[PDB]
Design a protein around this ligand. Structure first.
Ligand SMILES: Nc1nc2c(ncn2[C@H]2C[C@H](O)[C@@H](COP(=O)(O)OP(=O)(O)OP(=O)(O)O)O2)c(=O)[nH]1
Ligand SMILES: [Cl-]
Ligand SMILES: [Cl-]
Ligand SMILES: [Mg+2]
Ligand code: NA
Ligand code: NA
Ligand code: NA
Length: 326
DNA sequence: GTCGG
DNA sequence: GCTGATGCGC
DNA sequence: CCGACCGCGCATCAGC
């Protein structure tokens, strides 16, 4: 946690622009800056020194100068005093409440945690489960718990059919010692970019995991993306574990390396990598990397047979998952 | 809010 | 219903 | 200056 004071200021600035200002590029600006400063391996002693790194420009320069002087930023201090923005920031912490839902609720007087309980009638389903497990969803997961969760998922999956492969990605695959949640990549060989030979492929998995009582709730569920809740099982009169967020993404088996790249992340790394593809003249998503025509239209999928092939198309040296934390 | 063209 | 735009979350 | 800023799944709503 080297430059943590500066980086928390920028993350607090980014959350403001995102939740209150509804200014998604200001959000990404502060996020990039916070990311570049967090990877920089000295103690920033001046706003100008930070201005050297890309994505730290003039206005973040003044803000670093001030933070280094006072230990505060008064733009922030006053954002924290404003009760409209502080109520908006808080409501967005409920999964399913975004910036728009937050401001609407505040316009209706629903401002606090007890307000939300009074009015579970005015919530959609995702918002309800987000409120239900509001505290749990804010706890991290130690890696050790991730390892037991991995074992259940990989052993339950093997039972539905032995040809399912299931890869835990996200921060776990990047080597984190604690995780915000669990992210699971799922391949079955009967689902490729050329056919879906069997339906319910993802539904069977969600079904099996529900019946061992691992999956406990559902936020959203289509035929390739599940978004819900799980909980490790406890011993005899041991305290229950917190409930955990789990996403499971069924990707066509022949598109595994683009899928595993996407789900390993991080979100910022993905953004920077996909942006660099575009300046090199490629477009990357979770399925394919394609060349861009002389006009804008994306071409046809380039053949990929490892993660490193994707890095090589855009002329980056490969980076291990644990070096993709940005 | 930053940056590259 | 279907299509598309938006919110929200990755 | 000034526009472009990753890309997409699912839930939901408007409009036909
Ligand atoms: N292309 C893209 N991918 C994203 C974005 N957000 C998340 N992802 C991908 C990369 C993440 O590593 C992965 C899982 O999303 P998470 O929110 O769980 O992030 P991650 O697991 O890295 O962090 P965590 O420790 O769980 O909070 O999904 C995004 O805005 N764009
Ligand atoms: Cl691939
Ligand atoms: Cl594609
Ligand atoms: Mg995660
Ligand atoms: Na800079
Ligand atoms: Na939210
Ligand atoms: Na996730």
């Amino acid at each position: 946690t080297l430059n943590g004071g500066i980086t928390d200021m920028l993350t607090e600035l980014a959350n403001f622009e995102k939740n209150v200002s509804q200014a998604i590029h200001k959000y990404n600006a502060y996020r990039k800056a916070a990311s570049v400063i967090a990877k920089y391996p000295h103690k920033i002693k001046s706003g100008a020194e930070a201005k050297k790194l890309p994505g730290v420009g003039t206005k973040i320069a003044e803000k670093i100068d001030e933070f280094l002087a006072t230990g505060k930023l008064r733009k922030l201090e006053k954002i924290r005093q404003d009760d409209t923005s502080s109520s908006i920031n808080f409501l967005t912490r409920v999964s399913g409440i975004g910036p728009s839902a937050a401001r609407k609720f505040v316009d209706e007087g629903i401002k606090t945690l007890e307000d939300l309980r009074k009015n579970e009638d005015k919530l959609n389903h995702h918002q309800r489960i987000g409120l239900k497990y509001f505290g749990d969803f804010e706890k991290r997961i130690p890696r050790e718990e991730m390892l037991q969760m991995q074992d259940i998922v990989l052993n339950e999956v093997k039972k539905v059919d032995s040809e399912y492969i299931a890869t835990v990605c996200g921060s776990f695959r990047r080597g984190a010692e604690s995780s915000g949640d669990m992210d699971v990549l799922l391949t079955h060989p009967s689902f490729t970019s050329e056919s879906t030979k069997q339906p319910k492929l993802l539904h069977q998995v969600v079904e099996q995991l529900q019946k061992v009582h691992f999956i406990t709730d559902t936020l959203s569920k289509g035929e390739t993306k599940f978004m819900g809740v799980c909980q490790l099982p406890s011993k005899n009169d041991e305290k229950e574990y917190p409930h955990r967020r789990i996403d499971i993404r069924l990707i066509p088996k022949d598109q595994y390396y683009c899928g595993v790249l996407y789900f390993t992340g991080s979100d910022i790394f993905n953004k920077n990598m996909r942006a660099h593809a575009l300046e090199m003249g490629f477009t990357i998503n979770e399925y394919t990397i394609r060349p861009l025509g002389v006009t804008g239209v994306a071409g046809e999928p380039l053949p990929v047979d490892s993660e490193k092939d994707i890095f090589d198309y855009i002329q980056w040296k490969y980076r291990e998952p644990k070096d993709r934390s940005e």
